[PDB]
Amino acid sequence: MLQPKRTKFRKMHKGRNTGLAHRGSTVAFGQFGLKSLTRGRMTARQIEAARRTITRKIKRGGKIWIRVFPDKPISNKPLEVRMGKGKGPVEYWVCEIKPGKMLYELEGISEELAREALTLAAAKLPFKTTIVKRTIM
Amino acid sequence: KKAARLRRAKKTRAHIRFLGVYRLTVNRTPKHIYAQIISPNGGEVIAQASTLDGSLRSGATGNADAATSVGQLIAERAKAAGITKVAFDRSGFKYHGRVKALAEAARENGLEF
Amino acid sequence: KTMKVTQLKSGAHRLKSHKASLKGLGLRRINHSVVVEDTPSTRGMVNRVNYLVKVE
Amino acid sequence: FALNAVDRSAELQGKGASRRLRKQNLVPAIIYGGNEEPASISIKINELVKALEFEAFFSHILTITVDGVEEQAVIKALQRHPAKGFPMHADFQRIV
Amino acid sequence: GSSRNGRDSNPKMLGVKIFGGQAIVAGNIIVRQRGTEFHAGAGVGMGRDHTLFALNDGVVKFATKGKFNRRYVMVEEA
RNA sequence: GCUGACGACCAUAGCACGAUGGCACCACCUGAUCCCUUCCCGAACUCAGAAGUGAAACAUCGUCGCGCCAAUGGUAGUGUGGUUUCGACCAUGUGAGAGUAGGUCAUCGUCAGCU
RNA sequence: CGAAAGCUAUUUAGGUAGCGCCUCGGACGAAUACCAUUGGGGGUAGAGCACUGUUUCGGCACCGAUGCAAACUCCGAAUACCGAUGAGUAAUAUCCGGGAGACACACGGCGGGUGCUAACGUCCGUCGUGGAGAGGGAAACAACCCAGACCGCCAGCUAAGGCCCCAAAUUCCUAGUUAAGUGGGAAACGAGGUGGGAAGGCAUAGACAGCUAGGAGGUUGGCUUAGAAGCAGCCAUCCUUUAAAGAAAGCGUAAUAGCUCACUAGUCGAGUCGGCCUGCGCGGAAGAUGUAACGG
RNA sequence: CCUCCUAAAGAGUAACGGAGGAGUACGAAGGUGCGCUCAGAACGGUCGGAAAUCGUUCAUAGAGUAUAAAGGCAAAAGCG
RNA sequence: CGCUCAACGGAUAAAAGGUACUCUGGGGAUAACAGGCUGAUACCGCCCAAGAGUUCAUAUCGACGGCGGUGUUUGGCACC
């Protein structure tokens, strides 16, 4: 359950998600990269589940890099409460995702096993994903 | 230190530039003393007098008497150049000793400030 | 020299500036042709309302 | 280590003209450095993709033949689509 | 959860009042500001709230001058 | 040719490294009687002076090590009209930031002095 | 001729008053609007870590890579706003006075806060429409699109939208795609639908499929385990006979055993195999009066 | 009533929207003239340390500005 | 000079409650029932497969996660 240890402000605005992912579209740390073709919100629970499935598949044979962190807080309102009377608290944290953004990277493992693990992680995640080979340029 | 001396002269320099009057700036060294009159624009020298002048070059420079002389000659030069009302600029030097004698000579010899 | 300007489409529902541009051109109604001297100000007006005007 | 290019005219430059060119399946590129002024060219996207497949292409001396004049250059930068990944622009430097 | 913070202050209407190239007479307020976002050069005076106003007739000019690269407002006699 | 004062400009003018400069000028430097200084101290400031030195500082020269400046092209955004699957797209006008090639060890003004 | 549902204040919130908006009379006359050129300041969109934080990895708080932010900014537009000059067009702008009405607004875009980037939800800014507006289109449908009705004509041209019949106009022409009535509701995902595109692997030294024969020994590789023999799990994945055969890709056994597969040789003879991108299609797809998700 | 955001780069702009302060103080904490430059880090030094004061080297503000925040502040608006 | 006239443009120098014993003028400008919009929640279904199932993911069940349908619970709005 990734979460910032402390934050300057408890609550944050909803914001708008637009544009392509110009930064973070290139794989650096690891040879094997998984990218998101669709924009959306990535929850900490989603990140944890994908990490756990990838770790189980690798069985300590490869190194995993997480390029997504849920710094942004999300406020949700409780049931049987009228609209207004103040903003709700941060039930959960999400990471804004843009098309082409790096989610996970793998190194030190065979391509086929990495592809299978990335397939499992994609199945868990809400984003369409295409595996991309790392390119120098 | 010349750095500190310029640091403590800038207040008066800026206030005189705001006033927009001709400025009688002094600059004294252990050997020589110089006085010159700068235009309100701050980039034109219209009158000058130092102990490098031939009249008092081969003499007791770096002295209160030399400062008094330089004041008298720059006062005459300013009178001949048409300047009558200036703002004194000790240029960070304490208004005292050679600077004070220079200022008093200039003030008594035609210039009023 | 002079140029012929005609209003293809209605200007009632356009922005205030575009309506004033049509007034400056002199076109009060659709399929109305007017004569104006060819100069960059008039060309700028025709450019601003280009979509709803044509020039002969 | 050779590729064929075509002069990119001033009317093929800019945002809209660049998008039209990529719709006509040409990748814009600029050859600069060396001694002379920059030259704007277009490279067929399939040829450029095949050239980018090979790995020493990024570290050896390349030869651009612009329907005529010849240019020895080195690929300096490559702009790809953030999501699709296909090459969008090329930056080459003349080698002296 | 009640986080009671529904306060705000009234507007102050700060900003540039007369821009570059405009005719200006003595006493016109040019800039209303907090601190010296703009400084007073020749022809412009400075009030206790950092207001910049024209000391004489002329045309307002904006410039970046000095070592600190400060923004300056002047009134040129033109 | 160089030095000093006052300015223009405020890093392509800076930092860093190395070299040259003492006939003028500048700076150190000698002394604290006198003017004037220290919540103590001649450090600074101030006065009276040239025995000594360009050591430090200062000025000039050289470089690309840093800093700074910086294209062309492309991309992003964007006013107007239209379309839209609401992500965007088309026509037109505009056009960044970052990065790359590259540039830089400033350019001038008034006065005075030695040569 | 012609609004407003706005600001401010209010024992005020469905009232009232000042201002903004309408009308009439007078004064004034380009001082007003549009467009071209041009002088200005900005900190928004975007972008970025140089400050305030926050995040991952590696090296050793600091360095190098790597992301994020309404109350972060080393940067930074397009618009908009304030001015100047100059044409043309225009029933302009400003001031004084008489008379009001209005201070419940709504929907559709765009920039947002709130909400669940839910609501024909709620609050702002801004543009269009209705309000106060007919007409044609969207089947019916204030707010969407085209367009602003002075009256009359059994005249013509067009806008949006359409041209097989209801129902006015093409069973019009060219080139292709779909076989689902998709068109004419619905996603993750799945598949051997179909068309096209850029490249690949193999191939008459016989490519893919099919069929026949083999598919082995060290050896039950070592560890672990009650068992662990290619096939629970962990660490190797070496050698030999070879034409080839994996310390094994599956089924199977408590473990064996057993059946396959990869691979090789033989038969056959010509094209064949698997990835990527793009267009249109398929499943996923269940509700209550009656077809009833093209108006028919 | 004041500061920041919302607020869409002139001004203005709402929500029972997101965050904090005010209902004072000073005859000096005002005026003028003059003079001065902070926080930190490291090194050395009796008690004396992580950190007291003293000395040295860097240090455009990483300090201070009576007070909440924004802007500003070197001619300091900071300190005598 | 005297107001925490702080409901801060301050109604009087001077002021709390009950009503199911009640009553009048209005409102669907505004709530409870129902209908309407929405679908957070709820119900159902599907995707992945860690596992349980003596062995064995998929006979049967489906952790961490993801995507839909219904209007069908608890809700939101206040359109009749």
Side-chain angles (χ1 to χ4, degrees), chain C residues 10 13 20-21 23-24 28 37 41 45 48:
Chain C
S10 179
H13 317 292
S21 311
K23 284 321 320 193
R28 305 171 175 264
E37 61 206 280
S41 311
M45 293 180 184
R48 181 57 58 85

mmCIF file of all heavy atoms in Angstrom, chain C residues 10 13 20-21 23-24 28 37 41 45 48, chain G residues 33-35 86-90 129 147-148:
data_model
loop_
_atom_site.group_PDB
_atom_site.id
_atom_site.type_symbol
_atom_site.label_atom_id
_atom_site.label_comp_id
_atom_site.label_asym_id
_atom_site.label_seq_id
_atom_site.Cartn_x
_atom_site.Cartn_y
_atom_site.Cartn_z
ATOM 1 N N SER C 10 -25.551 33.587 -42.382
ATOM 2 C CA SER C 10 -26.083 34.583 -41.464
ATOM 3 C C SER C 10 -25.041 34.985 -40.428
ATOM 4 O O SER C 10 -24.266 34.158 -39.942
ATOM 5 C CB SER C 10 -27.330 34.041 -40.764
ATOM 6 O OG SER C 10 -27.847 34.986 -39.841
ATOM 7 N N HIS C 13 -25.915 35.274 -35.248
ATOM 8 C CA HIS C 13 -25.507 34.470 -34.104
ATOM 9 C C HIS C 13 -23.999 34.430 -33.896
ATOM 10 O O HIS C 13 -23.531 33.683 -33.029
ATOM 11 C CB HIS C 13 -26.050 33.048 -34.262
ATOM 12 C CG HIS C 13 -27.469 33.004 -34.735
ATOM 13 N ND1 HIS C 13 -28.524 33.432 -33.958
ATOM 14 C CD2 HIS C 13 -28.007 32.605 -35.912
ATOM 15 C CE1 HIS C 13 -29.650 33.286 -34.631
ATOM 16 N NE2 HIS C 13 -29.365 32.786 -35.819
ATOM 17 N N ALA C 20 -19.545 43.069 -35.750
ATOM 18 C CA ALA C 20 -18.996 44.384 -36.063
ATOM 19 C C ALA C 20 -18.132 44.341 -37.319
ATOM 20 O O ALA C 20 -18.079 45.314 -38.076
ATOM 21 C CB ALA C 20 -18.197 44.919 -34.875
ATOM 22 N N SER C 21 -17.429 43.229 -37.549
ATOM 23 C CA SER C 21 -16.660 43.084 -38.783
ATOM 24 C C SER C 21 -17.574 43.090 -40.000
ATOM 25 O O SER C 21 -17.262 43.713 -41.021
ATOM 26 C CB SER C 21 -15.832 41.798 -38.747
ATOM 27 O OG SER C 21 -15.117 41.687 -37.533
ATOM 28 N N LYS C 23 -20.533 44.537 -40.110
ATOM 29 C CA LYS C 23 -20.984 45.920 -40.236
ATOM 30 C C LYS C 23 -19.932 46.785 -40.920
ATOM 31 O O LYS C 23 -20.253 47.582 -41.809
ATOM 32 C CB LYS C 23 -21.332 46.483 -38.854
ATOM 33 C CG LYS C 23 -22.668 46.043 -38.211
ATOM 34 C CD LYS C 23 -23.905 45.907 -39.128
ATOM 35 C CE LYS C 23 -24.020 47.013 -40.190
ATOM 36 N NZ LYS C 23 -25.363 47.039 -40.841
ATOM 37 N N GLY C 24 -18.666 46.630 -40.531
ATOM 38 C CA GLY C 24 -17.605 47.388 -41.174
ATOM 39 C C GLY C 24 -17.476 47.065 -42.649
ATOM 40 O O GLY C 24 -17.212 47.949 -43.468
ATOM 41 N N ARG C 28 -25.289 43.684 -44.816
ATOM 42 C CA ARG C 28 -26.416 43.650 -43.896
ATOM 43 C C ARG C 28 -27.255 42.384 -43.999
ATOM 44 O O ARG C 28 -28.102 42.155 -43.131
ATOM 45 C CB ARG C 28 -27.319 44.865 -44.133
ATOM 46 C CG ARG C 28 -26.597 46.196 -44.048
ATOM 47 C CD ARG C 28 -27.482 47.338 -44.502
ATOM 48 N NE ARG C 28 -26.825 48.629 -44.321
ATOM 49 C CZ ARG C 28 -26.997 49.417 -43.264
ATOM 50 N NH1 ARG C 28 -27.800 49.058 -42.270
ATOM 51 N NH2 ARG C 28 -26.354 50.573 -43.192
ATOM 52 N N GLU C 37 -12.475 49.069 -51.133
ATOM 53 C CA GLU C 37 -11.090 49.195 -51.561
ATOM 54 C C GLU C 37 -10.241 48.100 -50.924
ATOM 55 O O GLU C 37 -10.443 47.717 -49.769
ATOM 56 C CB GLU C 37 -10.546 50.575 -51.196
ATOM 57 C CG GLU C 37 -10.549 50.860 -49.707
ATOM 58 C CD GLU C 37 -10.616 52.341 -49.405
ATOM 59 O OE1 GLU C 37 -9.567 53.013 -49.473
ATOM 60 O OE2 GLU C 37 -11.724 52.835 -49.111
ATOM 61 N N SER C 41 -6.559 46.281 -43.885
ATOM 62 C CA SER C 41 -7.638 46.290 -42.897
ATOM 63 C C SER C 41 -8.872 45.555 -43.413
ATOM 64 O O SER C 41 -9.457 44.726 -42.700
ATOM 65 C CB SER C 41 -7.987 47.728 -42.517
ATOM 66 O OG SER C 41 -6.817 48.456 -42.191
ATOM 67 N N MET C 45 -10.557 42.071 -42.110
ATOM 68 C CA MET C 45 -11.971 41.886 -41.796
ATOM 69 C C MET C 45 -12.526 40.659 -42.516
ATOM 70 O O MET C 45 -13.232 39.831 -41.920
ATOM 71 C CB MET C 45 -12.752 43.141 -42.187
ATOM 72 C CG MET C 45 -12.415 44.375 -41.356
ATOM 73 S SD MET C 45 -13.346 45.834 -41.857
ATOM 74 C CE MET C 45 -12.631 47.063 -40.773
ATOM 75 N N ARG C 48 -11.251 37.655 -40.806
ATOM 76 C CA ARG C 48 -11.938 37.374 -39.554
ATOM 77 C C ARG C 48 -13.290 36.722 -39.795
ATOM 78 O O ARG C 48 -13.695 35.843 -39.026
ATOM 79 C CB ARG C 48 -12.114 38.656 -38.734
ATOM 80 C CG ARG C 48 -12.805 38.427 -37.389
ATOM 81 C CD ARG C 48 -12.077 37.409 -36.520
ATOM 82 N NE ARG C 48 -10.690 37.779 -36.253
ATOM 83 C CZ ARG C 48 -10.312 38.586 -35.265
ATOM 84 N NH1 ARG C 48 -11.215 39.095 -34.436
ATOM 85 N NH2 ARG C 48 -9.029 38.872 -35.092
ATOM 86 P P A G 33 -14.307 51.965 -28.728
ATOM 87 O OP1 A G 33 -13.805 51.121 -27.614
ATOM 88 O OP2 A G 33 -13.361 52.808 -29.500
ATOM 89 O "O5'" A G 33 -15.071 51.018 -29.755
ATOM 90 C "C5'" A G 33 -16.100 50.150 -29.309
ATOM 91 C "C4'" A G 33 -16.730 49.395 -30.451
ATOM 92 O "O4'" A G 33 -17.498 50.300 -31.289
ATOM 93 C "C3'" A G 33 -15.772 48.728 -31.423
ATOM 94 O "O3'" A G 33 -15.243 47.508 -30.934
ATOM 95 C "C2'" A G 33 -16.635 48.574 -32.668
ATOM 96 O "O2'" A G 33 -17.531 47.480 -32.540
ATOM 97 C "C1'" A G 33 -17.431 49.879 -32.636
ATOM 98 N N9 A G 33 -16.773 50.935 -33.427
ATOM 99 C C8 A G 33 -16.123 52.046 -32.957
ATOM 100 N N7 A G 33 -15.623 52.810 -33.894
ATOM 101 C C5 A G 33 -15.963 52.153 -35.064
ATOM 102 C C6 A G 33 -15.719 52.457 -36.409
ATOM 103 N N6 A G 33 -15.050 53.546 -36.787
ATOM 104 N N1 A G 33 -16.189 51.605 -37.348
ATOM 105 C C2 A G 33 -16.855 50.520 -36.937
ATOM 106 N N3 A G 33 -17.148 50.126 -35.699
ATOM 107 C C4 A G 33 -16.669 50.997 -34.796
ATOM 108 P P C G 34 -13.698 47.140 -31.175
ATOM 109 O OP1 C G 34 -13.322 46.072 -30.217
ATOM 110 O OP2 C G 34 -12.909 48.396 -31.222
ATOM 111 O "O5'" C G 34 -13.685 46.506 -32.634
ATOM 112 C "C5'" C G 34 -14.544 45.426 -32.957
ATOM 113 C "C4'" C G 34 -14.729 45.294 -34.446
ATOM 114 O "O4'" C G 34 -15.329 46.503 -34.980
ATOM 115 C "C3'" C G 34 -13.459 45.115 -35.258
ATOM 116 O "O3'" C G 34 -13.004 43.772 -35.263
ATOM 117 C "C2'" C G 34 -13.868 45.620 -36.635
ATOM 118 O "O2'" C G 34 -14.572 44.622 -37.358
ATOM 119 C "C1'" C G 34 -14.830 46.757 -36.276
ATOM 120 N N1 C G 34 -14.152 48.073 -36.281
ATOM 121 C C2 C G 34 -13.650 48.554 -37.489
ATOM 122 O O2 C G 34 -13.824 47.935 -38.541
ATOM 123 N N3 C G 34 -13.038 49.752 -37.549
ATOM 124 C C4 C G 34 -12.866 50.450 -36.428
ATOM 125 N N4 C G 34 -12.233 51.618 -36.542
ATOM 126 C C5 C G 34 -13.349 49.990 -35.168
ATOM 127 C C6 C G 34 -13.979 48.806 -35.140
ATOM 128 P P C G 35 -11.571 43.381 -34.649
ATOM 129 O OP1 C G 35 -11.631 41.951 -34.256
ATOM 130 O OP2 C G 35 -11.180 44.404 -33.648
ATOM 131 O "O5'" C G 35 -10.579 43.494 -35.887
ATOM 132 C "C5'" C G 35 -10.817 42.764 -37.080
ATOM 133 C "C4'" C G 35 -10.250 43.479 -38.279
ATOM 134 O "O4'" C G 35 -10.871 44.785 -38.408
ATOM 135 C "C3'" C G 35 -8.761 43.778 -38.230
ATOM 136 O "O3'" C G 35 -7.965 42.669 -38.613
ATOM 137 C "C2'" C G 35 -8.630 44.971 -39.166
ATOM 138 O "O2'" C G 35 -8.604 44.555 -40.525
ATOM 139 C "C1'" C G 35 -9.932 45.719 -38.897
ATOM 140 N N1 C G 35 -9.783 46.805 -37.898
ATOM 141 C C2 C G 35 -8.994 47.929 -38.187
ATOM 142 O O2 C G 35 -8.402 47.986 -39.274
ATOM 143 N N3 C G 35 -8.888 48.913 -37.263
ATOM 144 C C4 C G 35 -9.539 48.815 -36.104
ATOM 145 N N4 C G 35 -9.413 49.804 -35.218
ATOM 146 C C5 C G 35 -10.355 47.693 -35.791
ATOM 147 C C6 C G 35 -10.451 46.725 -36.708
ATOM 148 P P G G 86 -3.636 59.635 -37.350
ATOM 149 O OP1 G G 86 -3.374 60.913 -38.057
ATOM 150 O OP2 G G 86 -4.698 59.574 -36.316
ATOM 151 O "O5'" G G 86 -3.951 58.517 -38.439
ATOM 152 C "C5'" G G 86 -2.995 58.196 -39.437
ATOM 153 C "C4'" G G 86 -3.447 57.043 -40.298
ATOM 154 O "O4'" G G 86 -3.411 55.801 -39.549
ATOM 155 C "C3'" G G 86 -4.871 57.113 -40.815
ATOM 156 O "O3'" G G 86 -5.007 57.988 -41.920
ATOM 157 C "C2'" G G 86 -5.173 55.655 -41.141
ATOM 158 O "O2'" G G 86 -4.615 55.283 -42.392
ATOM 159 C "C1'" G G 86 -4.418 54.928 -40.024
ATOM 160 N N9 G G 86 -5.301 54.552 -38.901
ATOM 161 C C8 G G 86 -5.625 55.315 -37.806
ATOM 162 N N7 G G 86 -6.436 54.713 -36.982
ATOM 163 C C5 G G 86 -6.667 53.475 -37.565
ATOM 164 C C6 G G 86 -7.468 52.388 -37.129
ATOM 165 O O6 G G 86 -8.156 52.303 -36.105
ATOM 166 N N1 G G 86 -7.422 51.321 -38.020
ATOM 167 C C2 G G 86 -6.694 51.301 -39.185
ATOM 168 N N2 G G 86 -6.769 50.186 -39.925
ATOM 169 N N3 G G 86 -5.944 52.312 -39.602
ATOM 170 C C4 G G 86 -5.976 53.360 -38.751
ATOM 171 P P A G 87 -6.455 58.540 -42.337
ATOM 172 O OP1 A G 87 -6.307 59.350 -43.573
ATOM 173 O OP2 A G 87 -7.087 59.142 -41.135
ATOM 174 O "O5'" A G 87 -7.262 57.219 -42.703
ATOM 175 C "C5'" A G 87 -8.287 57.231 -43.683
ATOM 176 C "C4'" A G 87 -8.326 55.930 -44.440
ATOM 177 O "O4'" A G 87 -7.643 54.899 -43.683
ATOM 178 C "C3'" A G 87 -9.711 55.360 -44.691
ATOM 179 O "O3'" A G 87 -10.328 55.941 -45.826
ATOM 180 C "C2'" A G 87 -9.446 53.865 -44.839
ATOM 181 O "O2'" A G 87 -9.018 53.548 -46.154
ATOM 182 C "C1'" A G 87 -8.281 53.656 -43.870
ATOM 183 N N9 A G 87 -8.700 53.141 -42.550
ATOM 184 C C8 A G 87 -8.428 53.707 -41.329
ATOM 185 N N7 A G 87 -8.901 53.032 -40.312
ATOM 186 C C5 A G 87 -9.517 51.938 -40.898
ATOM 187 C C6 A G 87 -10.209 50.844 -40.350
ATOM 188 N N6 A G 87 -10.396 50.673 -39.039
ATOM 189 N N1 A G 87 -10.705 49.923 -41.205
ATOM 190 C C2 A G 87 -10.511 50.103 -42.517
ATOM 191 N N3 A G 87 -9.878 51.089 -43.151
ATOM 192 C C4 A G 87 -9.397 51.986 -42.275
ATOM 193 P P G G 88 -11.605 56.903 -45.663
ATOM 194 O OP1 G G 88 -11.538 57.921 -46.741
ATOM 195 O OP2 G G 88 -11.701 57.342 -44.249
ATOM 196 O "O5'" G G 88 -12.832 55.941 -45.980
ATOM 197 C "C5'" G G 88 -12.804 55.100 -47.123
ATOM 198 C "C4'" G G 88 -13.329 53.722 -46.813
ATOM 199 O "O4'" G G 88 -12.471 53.066 -45.845
ATOM 200 C "C3'" G G 88 -14.710 53.668 -46.183
ATOM 201 O "O3'" G G 88 -15.742 53.786 -47.145
ATOM 202 C "C2'" G G 88 -14.697 52.326 -45.461
ATOM 203 O "O2'" G G 88 -14.965 51.262 -46.363
ATOM 204 C "C1'" G G 88 -13.240 52.232 -45.005
ATOM 205 N N9 G G 88 -13.023 52.651 -43.603
ATOM 206 C C8 G G 88 -12.330 53.772 -43.221
ATOM 207 N N7 G G 88 -12.235 53.925 -41.933
ATOM 208 C C5 G G 88 -12.903 52.829 -41.416
ATOM 209 C C6 G G 88 -13.123 52.472 -40.062
ATOM 210 O O6 G G 88 -12.765 53.061 -39.036
ATOM 211 N N1 G G 88 -13.839 51.288 -39.961
ATOM 212 C C2 G G 88 -14.295 50.555 -41.033
ATOM 213 N N2 G G 88 -14.953 49.440 -40.690
ATOM 214 N N3 G G 88 -14.090 50.872 -42.305
ATOM 215 C C4 G G 88 -13.389 52.022 -42.429
ATOM 216 P P U G 89 -17.103 54.561 -46.792
ATOM 217 O OP1 U G 89 -17.876 54.699 -48.051
ATOM 218 O OP2 U G 89 -16.769 55.769 -45.997
ATOM 219 O "O5'" U G 89 -17.881 53.540 -45.850
ATOM 220 C "C5'" U G 89 -18.216 52.241 -46.311
ATOM 221 C "C4'" U G 89 -18.770 51.388 -45.200
ATOM 222 O "O4'" U G 89 -17.723 51.071 -44.250
ATOM 223 C "C3'" U G 89 -19.856 52.030 -44.355
ATOM 224 O "O3'" U G 89 -21.131 51.965 -44.971
ATOM 225 C "C2'" U G 89 -19.768 51.255 -43.044
ATOM 226 O "O2'" U G 89 -20.460 50.019 -43.132
ATOM 227 C "C1'" U G 89 -18.266 50.971 -42.950
ATOM 228 N N1 U G 89 -17.546 51.905 -42.055
ATOM 229 C C2 U G 89 -17.628 51.686 -40.693
ATOM 230 O O2 U G 89 -18.284 50.778 -40.212
ATOM 231 N N3 U G 89 -16.924 52.571 -39.915
ATOM 232 C C4 U G 89 -16.156 53.628 -40.363
ATOM 233 O O4 U G 89 -15.573 54.352 -39.556
ATOM 234 C C5 U G 89 -16.113 53.785 -41.784
ATOM 235 C C6 U G 89 -16.790 52.934 -42.558
ATOM 236 P P A G 90 -22.272 53.027 -44.586
ATOM 237 O OP1 A G 90 -23.496 52.675 -45.349
ATOM 238 O OP2 A G 90 -21.701 54.392 -44.698
ATOM 239 O "O5'" A G 90 -22.556 52.729 -43.048
ATOM 240 C "C5'" A G 90 -23.084 51.475 -42.644
ATOM 241 C "C4'" A G 90 -23.123 51.344 -41.144
ATOM 242 O "O4'" A G 90 -21.781 51.310 -40.593
ATOM 243 C "C3'" A G 90 -23.788 52.483 -40.396
ATOM 244 O "O3'" A G 90 -25.200 52.426 -40.452
ATOM 245 C "C2'" A G 90 -23.217 52.329 -38.990
ATOM 246 O "O2'" A G 90 -23.904 51.322 -38.264
ATOM 247 C "C1'" A G 90 -21.791 51.850 -39.286
ATOM 248 N N9 A G 90 -20.803 52.944 -39.187
ATOM 249 C C8 A G 90 -20.223 53.688 -40.183
ATOM 250 N N7 A G 90 -19.379 54.594 -39.742
ATOM 251 C C5 A G 90 -19.404 54.438 -38.362
ATOM 252 C C6 A G 90 -18.734 55.093 -37.308
ATOM 253 N N6 A G 90 -17.862 56.086 -37.486
ATOM 254 N N1 A G 90 -18.991 54.687 -36.043
ATOM 255 C C2 A G 90 -19.865 53.692 -35.862
ATOM 256 N N3 A G 90 -20.555 53.003 -36.767
ATOM 257 C C4 A G 90 -20.278 53.427 -38.011
ATOM 258 P P U G 129 -27.853 34.221 -29.868
ATOM 259 O OP1 U G 129 -28.300 34.795 -31.161
ATOM 260 O OP2 U G 129 -27.622 35.120 -28.711
ATOM 261 O "O5'" U G 129 -28.910 33.115 -29.421
ATOM 262 C "C5'" U G 129 -29.427 32.179 -30.355
ATOM 263 C "C4'" U G 129 -30.152 31.047 -29.669
ATOM 264 O "O4'" U G 129 -29.298 30.457 -28.655
ATOM 265 C "C3'" U G 129 -31.416 31.419 -28.907
ATOM 266 O "O3'" U G 129 -32.551 31.569 -29.742
ATOM 267 C "C2'" U G 129 -31.543 30.277 -27.912
ATOM 268 O "O2'" U G 129 -32.083 29.118 -28.533
ATOM 269 C "C1'" U G 129 -30.079 30.019 -27.564
ATOM 270 N N1 U G 129 -29.660 30.757 -26.352
ATOM 271 C C2 U G 129 -30.032 30.239 -25.131
ATOM 272 O O2 U G 129 -30.682 29.216 -25.021
ATOM 273 N N3 U G 129 -29.617 30.962 -24.044
ATOM 274 C C4 U G 129 -28.881 32.131 -24.062
ATOM 275 O O4 U G 129 -28.576 32.679 -23.004
ATOM 276 C C5 U G 129 -28.533 32.606 -25.365
ATOM 277 C C6 U G 129 -28.928 31.916 -26.437
ATOM 278 P P A G 147 -27.194 30.242 -41.031
ATOM 279 O OP1 A G 147 -26.578 30.844 -42.239
ATOM 280 O OP2 A G 147 -26.544 30.417 -39.710
ATOM 281 O "O5'" A G 147 -28.693 30.772 -40.923
ATOM 282 C "C5'" A G 147 -29.555 30.745 -42.052
ATOM 283 C "C4'" A G 147 -30.975 31.095 -41.686
ATOM 284 O "O4'" A G 147 -31.478 30.172 -40.684
ATOM 285 C "C3'" A G 147 -31.192 32.461 -41.062
ATOM 286 O "O3'" A G 147 -31.208 33.507 -42.018
ATOM 287 C "C2'" A G 147 -32.512 32.278 -40.324
ATOM 288 O "O2'" A G 147 -33.615 32.370 -41.211
ATOM 289 C "C1'" A G 147 -32.389 30.835 -39.833
ATOM 290 N N9 A G 147 -31.892 30.760 -38.446
ATOM 291 C C8 A G 147 -30.600 30.606 -38.013
ATOM 292 N N7 A G 147 -30.484 30.584 -36.707
ATOM 293 C C5 A G 147 -31.785 30.736 -36.249
ATOM 294 C C6 A G 147 -32.340 30.793 -34.958
ATOM 295 N N6 A G 147 -31.624 30.700 -33.836
ATOM 296 N N1 A G 147 -33.676 30.952 -34.858
ATOM 297 C C2 A G 147 -34.396 31.046 -35.981
ATOM 298 N N3 A G 147 -33.990 31.005 -37.246
ATOM 299 C C4 A G 147 -32.659 30.848 -37.312
ATOM 300 P P G G 148 -31.264 35.039 -41.540
ATOM 301 O OP1 G G 148 -31.306 35.905 -42.743
ATOM 302 O OP2 G G 148 -30.204 35.251 -40.523
ATOM 303 O "O5'" G G 148 -32.669 35.146 -40.808
ATOM 304 C "C5'" G G 148 -33.161 36.393 -40.334
ATOM 305 C "C4'" G G 148 -34.457 36.211 -39.588
ATOM 306 O "O4'" G G 148 -34.204 35.414 -38.398
ATOM 307 C "C3'" G G 148 -35.121 37.498 -39.105
ATOM 308 O "O3'" G G 148 -36.538 37.356 -39.161
ATOM 309 C "C2'" G G 148 -34.670 37.585 -37.653
ATOM 310 O "O2'" G G 148 -35.517 38.345 -36.817
ATOM 311 C "C1'" G G 148 -34.655 36.113 -37.257
ATOM 312 N N9 G G 148 -33.779 35.801 -36.126
ATOM 313 C C8 G G 148 -32.542 36.328 -35.844
ATOM 314 N N7 G G 148 -32.021 35.855 -34.748
ATOM 315 C C5 G G 148 -32.975 34.967 -34.275
ATOM 316 C C6 G G 148 -32.967 34.152 -33.120
ATOM 317 O O6 G G 148 -32.088 34.053 -32.258
ATOM 318 N N1 G G 148 -34.134 33.404 -33.021
ATOM 319 C C2 G G 148 -35.173 33.439 -33.917
ATOM 320 N N2 G G 148 -36.211 32.640 -33.646
ATOM 321 N N3 G G 148 -35.190 34.190 -35.003
ATOM 322 C C4 G G 148 -34.066 34.925 -35.112
#
